Amino acid sequence: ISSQLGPIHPPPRTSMTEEYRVPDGMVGLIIGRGGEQINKIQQDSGCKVQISPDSGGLPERSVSLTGAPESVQKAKMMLDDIVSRGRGG
Numbered sequence: 001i002s003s004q005l006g007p008i009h010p011p012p013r014t015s016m017t018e019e020y021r022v023p024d025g026m027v028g029l030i031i032g033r034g035g036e037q038i039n040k041i042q043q044d045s046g047c048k049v050q051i052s053p054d055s056g057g058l059p060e061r062s063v064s065l066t067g068a069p070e071s072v073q074k075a076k077m078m079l080d081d082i083v084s085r086g087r088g089g
Contacts, residue, residue, distance in 0.1 A: 001057055016072040018065035020079045026086035027051065027061040030078065038078070047075035
């Protein structure tokens with residue numbers, strides 16, 4: 001399982017679960033200043049962005065995205081940025 005998405009139609013608390021397959025080095029970059037960057041954005045947006053070093057099914061890191069439509073947007077926006085510059089797309 002990867003990316004998640006959301007098989008259920010309820011609010012983005014689960015309909016916007018994004019499991020982001022992100023290279024572990026690009027996680028070093030997603031935190032930017034060493035961690036605080038992602039905290040700023042995930043706390044600012046209101047999105048439940050959790051970095052998973054355990055991953056689950058991926059060898060690299062898996063970032064789980066959940067929250068509200070606009071929070072999950074802001075959150076996944078930063079994820080898109082770094083994961084695009086790392087994995088291409």
